């Protein structure tokens, strides 16, 4: 895109850095002036300087030309905050501004305005780091401190001292901004709620400024002052934006359908490959329109949302891009993968909290969702279907993994297709942190574009169009797009069955697969904030801060939750979590993740989990299928449930945590490490009497009283004055109700799996 668009984007993104400098230094000057002065100390660019200086249109508008870009940026800021700041009169009286602005308040938690009203929490402003322990919001973190922002300002100045404001560096700046201001409020107005990070605020301002620029360029309207300042109320009514989206169907089937050995390496490679396919689709769509990742609201799980200019050229470019990528998917994966695009026209007034209404903010999503659904139902036209059904191929042999016929090759005396071959090659390249896009080298990720994972030292010897860096907040020497995925891996999957044994040989030789899902994520996105304030809390900014909160929780933070655990996180994006490892570590990881989530979201969103146990060398597709069934069963238990190893042990998460994992299983490892192998068999008998209580209810209870008082006689002298507790304990667990019987059954089964020697 043009140099003018580059300058406009940079001015829109850097307009509120003066707020950061003002909070760090404690100066009493206006934030725009401080930002412009600080920018002039580090870069000689007049256009960005005046954009930062005059991003409030009330500040010396008469000195600015009618075609000046700040009249765009200004109104874009009004779009990003969600509130028309002209009506609040906060820019015209300094004395009132000193009493309205509460500068001693940190960023509020996004969940303070989510769901039912609860206690308020506030985030301590911290620089995001991959290895850091979580930054949970807290009501104690409300007071503001200058020392926290001192390091923020120092690092921002150090990174922007030698920054080049050109095209190729643009993406890296966004990463830097995400690294620093994700826990700093955009506005400290007492009348407003500071749940919006300045991070996303500046990204949204830049995206909307680009959209308005494209719209005005299409319509030939270059009098920005007249259109966006004098007639801003009229511009707010014009349907100026397109809420676009794409959905890629076939991700689960493509990832999990592996039939032979080597399924682990393929499985992780396909997960990374498909995430990068989604990222490349988003970035190539943005490149074709001359936009950048600032317009990307959310990417992940095959779902991506964008805010685009509402022009016929945008609709055309969307249709032709969708057709080209559908042709590419038909050529490379036949009908397994299919991308469907979506869009809905909306105005500025549909997302400002003071002007919009809840059902319109729902309908702007619903239009794109409905159109995506209709395109998903009717996929291919007559010509494509006829081309698919031409037949006429005499192939004796098939692919051993994905059963494809196209382009079969021999490799390690197996017969793989071209895609399988590329994925086997890429499985050794996933260890690198740099992934380039070439024209014919690597896994075909797009039209005349292939993805290749290349080490850093060889990057200077490779030809590419775009480069991606995985799990890095540091702006490297190479201008690269930064992506974050959950990729923790302790050992190989085929070793996890044997790794469940301890140093003493204790533990069953089994492995576990956990599938976890966030409950009603889509309902949370659509109307999770609409419960409070009569729906005044339904705007784009808070929904997309919710999206970034979940993204940082599930693509960066799960890697820290999985630290020091013998497991691998295969897929972690959006709401679906897939992990595989030793069964004890899998259970502990699931419980820890649930607890950290319930602490992160204040309790307002729950998970549902399925944990399937399997033996060594179990084919991965079967493990994924059975664990998906267990996850569905856990969902069926009014959600907020965990299902362990079959549907019969479905519990509420809090019940499993409080009563089973940390209560009964503890009060069984205890007493039952005090009994020999002769008395560690009654553990099987107590299981049968719990599985057979509905037969012979009252003599099954008697059979218990007897069998419990026999374990307490087969013991050892005074070791038996210690098993006098089990009898009293397991008796009441047996006699209370069915829920505690099931909990004791699961606890006994867990203990049996822990102490097994075979």
């Amino acid at each position: 895109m043009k140099k003018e668009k580059i300058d406009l984007f940079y001015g829109a993104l850097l307009h509120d850095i003066g707020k950061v400098i003002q909070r760090a230094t404690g100066e009493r000057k206006k934030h725009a002036l401080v930002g412009a002065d600080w920018f002039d100390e580090i870069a000689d660019n007049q256009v960005i300087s005046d954009q930062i200086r005059y991003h409030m249109a009330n500040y010396q508008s008469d000195k600015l030309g009618n075609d000046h870009l700040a009249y765009i940026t200004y109104i874009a800021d009004n779009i990003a905050s969600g509130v028309d700041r002209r009506q609040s009169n906060e820019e015209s009286d300094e004395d009132a501004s000193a009493k309205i602005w509460d500068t001693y308040t940190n960023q509020a938690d996004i969940f303070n305005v989510f769901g039912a009203q609860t206690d308020k929490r506030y985030f301590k402003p911290t620089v995001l780091n991959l290895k850091s322990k979580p930054n949970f919001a807290s009501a104690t973190y409300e007071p503001f401190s200058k020392g926290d922002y001192a390091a923020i300002a120092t690092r921002i100045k150090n990174e922007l001292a030698e920054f080049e404001f050109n095209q190729a560096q643009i993406d890296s700046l966004l990463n830097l901004f995400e690294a620093i201001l994700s826990f700093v409020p955009s506005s400290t107005n007492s009348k407003e709620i500071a749940d919006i990070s300045l991070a996303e605020h500046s990204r949204l301002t830049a995206a909307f400024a680009l959209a308005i620029y494209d719209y005005l360029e299409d319509k030939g309207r270059h009098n920005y002052k007249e259109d966006l300042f004098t007639k801003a109320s009229a511009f707010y009514e014009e349907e100026a934006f397109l809420l676009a989206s794409f959905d890629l169907s076939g991700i689960q089937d493509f990832i999990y359908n592996i039939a032979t050995s080597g399924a682990a390496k393929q499985l992780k490679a396909r997960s990374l490959y498909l995430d990068f396919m989604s990222e490349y689709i988003a970035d190539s769509l943005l490149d074709k329109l001359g936009l950048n990742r600032a317009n990307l609201l959310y990417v992940g799980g095959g779902h991506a949302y964008f805010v685009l200019a509402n022009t016929e050229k945008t609709v055309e470019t969307l249709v032709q891009f969708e057709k080209d990528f559908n042709q590419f998917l038909l050529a490379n994966f036949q009908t397994r993968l299919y991308v469907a695009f979506g869009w809905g026209s909306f105005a500025a007034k549909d997302i400002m909290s003071e002007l919009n209404s809840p059902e319109s903010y729902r309908q702007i999503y619903q239009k794109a969702s409905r159109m995506i659904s209709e395109k998903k139902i009717s996929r291919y036209d007559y010509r494509t279907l006829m081309l698919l059904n031409r037949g006429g191929k005499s192939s004796e042999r098939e692919c051993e993994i994905c059963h494809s016929v196209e382009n079969l090759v021999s490799y390690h005396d197996q017969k793989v297709c071209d895609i399988c071959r590329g994925l086997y090659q890429f499985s050794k390249e996933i260890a690198h942190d740099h992934f380039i896009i070439t024209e014919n080298e690597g896994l075909p990720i797009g039209p005349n574009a292939c993805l290749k994972g290349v080490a850093f030292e060889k990057l200077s010897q490779e030809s590419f169009s775009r480069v991606y860096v995985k799990n890095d907040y540091k702006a490297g020497t190479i201008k690269a797009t930064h992506v974050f995925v959950g990729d923790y891996q302790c050992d190989e999957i085929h070793k996890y069955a044997a790794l469940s044994k301890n140093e003493d040989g204790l533990g069953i030789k089994r492995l576990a697969v956990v599938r976890l899902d966030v409950d009603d994520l889509g309902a949370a996105f659509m109307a999770g904030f609409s419960r409070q304030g009569n729906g005044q809390y339904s705007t784009l900014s808070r929904s997309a801060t919710f999206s970034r909160s979940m993204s940082l929780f599930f693509k960066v933070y799960i890697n820290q939750f999985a630290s020091d655990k013998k497991l691998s996180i295969i897929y972690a994006g959006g709401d679906d979590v897939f992990a595989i490892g030793s069964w004890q570590d899998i259970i502990a990881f699931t419980v820890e993740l649930r607890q950290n989530f319930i602490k992160w979201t204040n309790g307002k969103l729950t998970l549902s989990a399925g944990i399937g146990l399997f033996a060594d060398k179990t084919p991965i597709s079967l493990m994924a299928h059975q664990t998906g069934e267990l996850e569905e069963a856990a969902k069926g238990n009014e959600k907020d449930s965990i299902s362990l190893f079959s549907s019969d042990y479905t519990f509420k998460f809090d019940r499993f945590i409080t009563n089973v994992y940390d209560d009964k299983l503890e009060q069984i490892r205890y007493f039952f490490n005090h009994q020999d192998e002769r008395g560690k068999n009654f553990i099987y008998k107590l299981i049968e009497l719990l599985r057979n209580y509905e037969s012979e209810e009252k003599m099954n209870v008697a059979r218990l009283a007897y069998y419990l008082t026999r374990l307490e006689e087969l013991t050892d002298k005074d070791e038996r004055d210690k098993f006098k507790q089990f009898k009293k304990l397991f008796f009441k667990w047996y006699t209370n109700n069915e829920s505690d019987r099931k909990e004791a059954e699961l606890a006994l089964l867990l203990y049996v799996y822990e102490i097994r020697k075979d």
């Binding site: 009717s378 291919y380 279907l385 059904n389 006429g392 016929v405 309902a523 033996a615 084919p619 059975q626």
Partner: protein, 297 residues
């Protein structure tokens, strides 16, 4: 369009691409192939081929039968014209998920599903996997998936009343249906029942209103356009290895993409007994794609 053939299974395996995958119900190409093999083993293959060449022969995918015929969910009718409600988004997403999970509806309320009503799936079969080994080479540990039915639930198809088809079904009931038939899977007991008066009046083949398909049928090239513009459908592969008693080596047959059930259309079409055989092959491989339709309000 004449009878309501019922097959009561105990264990079955309908592979969807792998030995460890088993669907609840099979498709009509599988049962047509089973009939072809039983007819050729009988020796009366030519008579069955001549019967299939006629336009009277109609077949449909197996559907669940639990005290009444079931029909596949009509893909393409979640339409808001009968589901327009003022409920919250949580309930809208819950009902959308419930309808997406739904695959089969009872006959007595199919039109009720078109009135905006929401129904849940019923317990028909449990799909479980069993591990087996070979105790002479200690490396093969293969998993087989099953479709063990319960609660007096059977499968049913709709077809013309023919003595050849009746005896073919009777020989099928001791030969199994799909999967590892010589291992304890696929066998069934057959029953012949009359089509209910609320169903036979709806099974149609030739008119120009809204028709929901009952067979995994690929239309002829002449009328695919009408299925493209105003047709809602799902695409299903039909790949696999072509069984053959004439070749030592197993040949993969051509992958063919049909229209699933129940795909909704605005007009009926004609099916194909498509030759999916590989080149230079001695005998044909017939893939049956011929639709039986259901009228909608």
């Amino acid at each position: 369009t004449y009878k309501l053939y019922i097959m009561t299974f105990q264990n079955a395996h309908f592979g969807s691409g792998t030995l460890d995958s088993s669907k609840l119900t099979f498709s009509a190409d599988r049962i047509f192939s089973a009939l072809v093999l039983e007819a050729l083993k009988m020796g009366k293959l030519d008579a069955f081929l001549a019967e299939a060449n006629q336009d009277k022969f109609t077949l449909t995918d197996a559907f669940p039968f639990q005290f009444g015929p079931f029909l596949p969910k009509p893909i393409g009718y979640p339409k808001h014209d009968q589901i327009d409600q003022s409920v919250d988004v949580k309930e809208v997403r819950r009902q959308a998920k419930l309808s997406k999970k739904l695959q089969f509806l009872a006959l007595e309320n199919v039109d009720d599903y078109l009135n905006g009503e929401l129904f849940e799936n019923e317990e028909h079969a449990v799909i479980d996997t069993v591990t087996k080994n070979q105790p002479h080479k200690d490396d093969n540990l293969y998993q087989v998936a099953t479709t063990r039915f319960s609660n007096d639930t059977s499968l049913y198809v709709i077809a013309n009343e023919s003595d050849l088809l009746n005896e073919l079904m009777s020989s099928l009931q001791y030969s199994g249906l799909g999967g590892k038939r010589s291992s304890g899977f696929g066998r069934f007991e057959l029953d012949i029942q009359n089509i209910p008066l609320e169903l036979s009046d709806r099974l149609t083949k030739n008119h120009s209103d809204k028709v929901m398909s009952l067979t995994t049928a690929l239309p002829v090239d002449a009328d695919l356009e009408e299925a493209m513009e105003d047709g809602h459908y799902l695409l299903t592969k039909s790949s696999g290895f072509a069984f053959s008693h004439a070749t030592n080596e197993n040949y993969r047959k051509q992958d063919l993409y049909k229209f699933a059930s129940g795909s909704t259309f605005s007009k009926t079409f004609e099916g194909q007994i498509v030759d999916v055989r590989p080149l230079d092959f001695p005998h044909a491989v017939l893939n049956y794609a011929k639709p039986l339709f259901f009228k909608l309000e």
